[PDB]
Design a protein around this nucleic acid. Structure first.
Lengths: 147, 102, 84, 207, 60, 128
RNA sequence: AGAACCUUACCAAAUCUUGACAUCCUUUGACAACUCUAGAGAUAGAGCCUUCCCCUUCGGGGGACAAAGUGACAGGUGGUGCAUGGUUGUCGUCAGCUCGUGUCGUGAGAUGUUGGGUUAAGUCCCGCAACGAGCGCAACCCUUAAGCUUAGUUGCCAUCAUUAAGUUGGGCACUCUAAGUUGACUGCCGGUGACAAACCGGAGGAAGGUGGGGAUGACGUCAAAUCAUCAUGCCCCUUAUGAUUUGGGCUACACACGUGCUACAAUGGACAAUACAAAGGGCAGCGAAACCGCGAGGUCAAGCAAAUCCCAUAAAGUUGUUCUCAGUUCGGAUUGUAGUCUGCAACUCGACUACAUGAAGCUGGAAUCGCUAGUAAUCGUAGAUCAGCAUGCUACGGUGAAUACGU
């Protein structure tokens, strides 16, 4: 039931990257994911000159849901605040999911486009956050006097 | 490596019987001599045989067997017809597999 | 698939040699599984025992891609209702 | 569902009923032993032996049948065992030294009891009294508990059934038991009647 | 039927291998090991008797 | 000089550590660490024993290692490091045991049982 | 857990009758092989010789042969798993199920096993006309997680010398190897808790609450499966429901379903270089080097009954180049050709290589399956069975996370 975090991934010096890479490693090939994440994080610094830390942090800030819903029982669904661990997990999860749905041919450019367009408060991850925040916190009428 | 030597190899299917036989042979070997090599173990090869607990169907309920095989090595230097008898005289019990060599 | 060499049934050889030096026959009884057709096997009417009744087949010159091995199958319509 | 404890206790609380040099050629000596294991029925039928041990050195054969009636097998003054050797070497084609061995607490053993119960079941004796007197005699002999099960169409009757009258403790799922399981078969006019005797006679190791 | 195949696998053969290795006691040819030449069930059952050198414990 | 030697075991691998103080440089099997790990940029995790224990460092290291994949053995170095650093002084154990890196993992692969096959996948059921 | 034949029970034909085969009597005889002929073989038709061998005093006794008579007989994969032994699945590793002494109840029964607390567990504590016992969970066993002693070859080279090399001088420090022990047992403390059980935290330790895993599967349920492993009641066949051989067939083909393998490609395709395993097998078996060949493979012969030699390069993986979104240098299905190995024969039906084609297929609906951490996902390896043939099975290692808010 606990999490059993992963501590060091000083490439580049940060912690969210450590959790991120463990999702891209389809079929257990960690080096390819590490290489492409490094190439993409150097690319996002190359184009539209800035540091990778600022763009990544503010991008996952624009795409981290803060309220979320869960269903139970007729059909009712309780909006629920999200734990920070699950907050970042969902953020990275939907970020990678929509980077996949972007469908570009390059190792790195799709992720760079995704995070840098999120840095503009737009994009499919931002679209998912907006859709969830529209369905949620608008029907918080019924299941608010609950857990 | 070149030297006078007597070398033997031991095989049995019970660690207690094989090590007690090795101990008694070391006793007899250093009794009628010296500088004997101890009961050096060996990676003790195993076996395996997959078989289904069944008569007519149901291979799902498989079950396993093995035939563990202890192997032992002892070396003797500076031979004599005394260590020869100490080897070829007493091997009891007769579950062990002895092969005298030089 | 033998490079060791051909493998004509010697038994078919012994019969066919006498069958070929003089006038041939238009019907032959055999089993014809451990042999094959060669240039000297032309002009005969051998019968591979398909399993139920051996059917005599007349040797032609043009069967080099085809052989003596089999010509009358045992499946024999079909086994099925429909067709190819 | 259940398994035979002799197949689980083996290697730990008991050695094997046959021993020979462990060369990789097993078929020759194993099926030599098979011929002995077949031919020993010709002594079991009258002596009701327990089990045969067979040691096998390089050039000799030394065996030992656990029996309760040596007289039958040893002859008057040795009149039988040498003749047993003569009719044994004819198929063994190798020398042998048969050494009859006696079991202590003769009638407490499992295979002797199972053979006995099958025996009086052969001549149409009631199943209840035989097993009751067997278990009572076994408890007299001293033990921590025995079990006895019978199978088939009891009393020569309709569809088969299964019963048991167990007394004392008979630990089965433990692993330091050294229990003598046995088995037997019985036919009078119909099918076959098997038995599954169980005993438990103390905790002891072979070392 | 099995009875005549005991002779079939015993008699000489026209050439090298028209043979199959079956168990001596059990007539089942399938699932046999050349090390022992006993079938599946018989060698399993004789393992429980504690007659053949070796073990059945498994768990390895 | 003086040399401290403690073994390291993890994931069906074996490590023979040779620790000798110095400026700090490792050449595994007479070959540099970057020349032995694919790709790899995770050697800084191997420097964590030097980052929390013997801050900041460092000691020269020579090692010979065989068996198992690169991850299990590239991680086996750290337990030998911890053993040698405890041999040097028991002061370092208080900083070691609060973070681990000495407790050799007791977890390896598992046998296999009916249900698994050539790939480590469980069976399905009969639907419809 | 190996259907060319054999295996195989079934089919076609040719054949057999104490029979393919087993015991018994008589009768003998040591036992046969290679050739000629017929025959697809089975079989025979002949040459020829298998030739009283152990014990013999002329006989004989004898393992073993012999063909016939030959009566018991043999034989049946012939039916009944709803008569059975036995064996095996499933409920289900579910935590329950009962018995002895006493008591209550007219009795059937209850009582313990009920109630509270507690546990993965009828596990444990307390209370209670219930008290004890048994089967079961636990452990008892194997393996794995650490240390120590014993012993150092074929294993290892840390001090060295040397070498292509641990290959040899030596070394046994280290690793490793296998025997024995040490260790983990609420064991100690603090708190909670009917002061008890027990719970929580902490230290220590390599390992804290049956450590991880395996083996083990209660009384019994499914008249579960098996007479085709075997044994076996009853019934049926016998000049055939038995027996031999050759060939066919178990592999057919409008389709349905299951199980799995490979693709529908840019975490990718092809080429080049390059590091990292474990376990197992091998005697008439493993086939080292070398040479030949694009290749499957061929010559060769060293070493090897095994810590020695071989299978056996590990693969994924890492460094590079190129390909630049197409039915694509995608995919590799189909077909033909030319070849490799086994087997007598790869034609219905073996496997493999090279060339030639390059299909459907651009992540899949209703519905549905598996999985709580070395797991899944994913990559290779070996073994069994095996004259040759495994996407299957067993086993081994490599890599390897996401989440479990909560009932």
């Amino acid at each position: 039931v606990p999490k059993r975090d992963v501590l060091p991934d000083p490439i580049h010096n940060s912690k969210l990257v450590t959790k991120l890479i463990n999702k891209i490693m389809l079929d257990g090939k960690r080096g390819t994911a590490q290489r492409i994440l490094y190439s993409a994080f150097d690319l996002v610094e190359q184009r539209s000159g800035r540091d990778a830390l600022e763009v990544f942090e503010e991008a996952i800030n624009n795409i981290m849901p803060v309220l979320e819903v869960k269903a139970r029982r007729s059909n009712y669904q309780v909006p629920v605040e999200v734990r920070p661990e699950r907050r970042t997990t969902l953020g990275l999860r939907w970020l990678v999911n929509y980077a996949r749905l972007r469908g570009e041919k390059t190792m790195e450019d799709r992720l760079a486009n995704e995070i840098l367009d999120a840095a503009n408060n737009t994009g499919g991850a931002v679209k998912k956050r907006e859709d969830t925040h529209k369905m949620a916190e608008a029907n918080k009428a019924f299941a608010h006097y609950r857990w | 490596m070149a030297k006078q030597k007597i070398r033997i190899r031991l095989k049995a299917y019970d660690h207690r019987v094989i090590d007690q036989s090795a101990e008694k042979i070391v006793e007899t070997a250093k009794r009628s001599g010296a500088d004997v090599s101890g009961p050096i173990p060996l990676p003790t090869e195993k076996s395996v045989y997959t078989i289904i607990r069944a008569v007519h169907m149901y291979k799902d309920s498989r079950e396993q067997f093995e035939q563990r095989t202890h192997k032992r090595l002892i070396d003797i230097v500076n031979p004599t017809p005394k260590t020869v008898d100490a080897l070829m005289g007493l091997n009891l019990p007769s579950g062990v597999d002895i092969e005298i060599k030089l | 698939s033998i490079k060791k060499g051909p493998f004509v049934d010697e038994h078919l050889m012994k019969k066919v040699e006498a069958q070929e030096g003089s006038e041939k026959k238009q019907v032959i009884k055999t089993w014809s599984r451990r042999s094959t057709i060669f240039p000297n096997f032309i002009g005969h009417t051998f019968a591979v025992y398909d399993g139920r009744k051996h059917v005599p087949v007349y040797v032609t010159e043009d069967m080099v891609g085809h052989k003596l091995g089999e010509f009358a199958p045992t499946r024999t319509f079909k086994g099925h209702v429909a067709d190819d | 569902q259940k398994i035979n404890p002799i197949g689980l206790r083996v290697g730990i609380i008991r050695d094997w009923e046959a021993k020979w040099y462990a060369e990789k050629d097993f078929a020759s000596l194993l099926h030599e032993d098979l011929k002995i294991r077949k031919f020993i029925d010709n002594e079991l039928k009258e002596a009701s032996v327990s089990h045969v041990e067979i040691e096998r050195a390089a050039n000799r054969i030394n065996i030992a049948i656990h029996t309760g009636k040596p007289g039958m097998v040893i002859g008057k003054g040795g009149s039988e065992i040498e003749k047993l050797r003569n009719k044994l070497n004819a198929l063994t084609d190798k020398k042998v030294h048969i050494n009859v061995i006696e079991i202590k607490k003769v009638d407490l053993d499992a295979r002797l009891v199972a053979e006995n119960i099958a025996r009086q079941l052969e001549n149409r004796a009631s199943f209840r009294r035989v097993q009751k007197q067997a278990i009572t005699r076994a408890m007299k002999l001293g033990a921590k508990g025995i079990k006895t099960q019978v199978s088939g169409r009891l009393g020569g009757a309709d569809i088969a059934r299964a019963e048991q009258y167990s007394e004392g403790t008979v630990p089965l799922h433990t692993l330091r038991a050294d229990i003598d399981y046995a088995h037997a078969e019985a036919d009078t006019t119909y099918g076959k009647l098997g038995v599954k005797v169980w005993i438990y006679r103390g905790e002891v190791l072979p070392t | 039927a099995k009875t005549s195949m005991v002779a079939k696998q015993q008699k000489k053969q026209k050439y090298a291998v028209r043979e199959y290795t079956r168990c001596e006691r059990c007539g089942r040819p399938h699932s046999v090991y050349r090390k022992f030449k006993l079938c599946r069930i018989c060698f399993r059952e004789l393992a429980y008797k504690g007659q053949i050198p070796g073990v059945r414990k498994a768990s390895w | 000089q003086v040399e401290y030697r403690g073994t390291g075991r993890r994931k069906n691998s074996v490590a023979r550590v040779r620790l000798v103080p110095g400026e700090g440089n490792i050449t595994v099997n007479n070959r540099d660490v970057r020349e032995y790990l694919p790709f790899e940029s995770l050697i800084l995790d191997l420097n964590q024993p030097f980052d929390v224990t013997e801050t900041k460092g460092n000691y020269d290291v020579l090692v010979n290692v065989h068996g198992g994949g690169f991850t299990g053995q590239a991680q086996a170095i750290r337990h030998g490091i911890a053993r040698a650093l405890l041999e040097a002084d028991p002061e370092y154990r208080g900083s070691l045991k609060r973070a681990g890196l000495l407790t050799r993992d007791p977890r390896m692969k598992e046998r296999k049982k009916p249900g698994l096959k050539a790939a480590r996948r469980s069976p399905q059921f009969s639907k419809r």
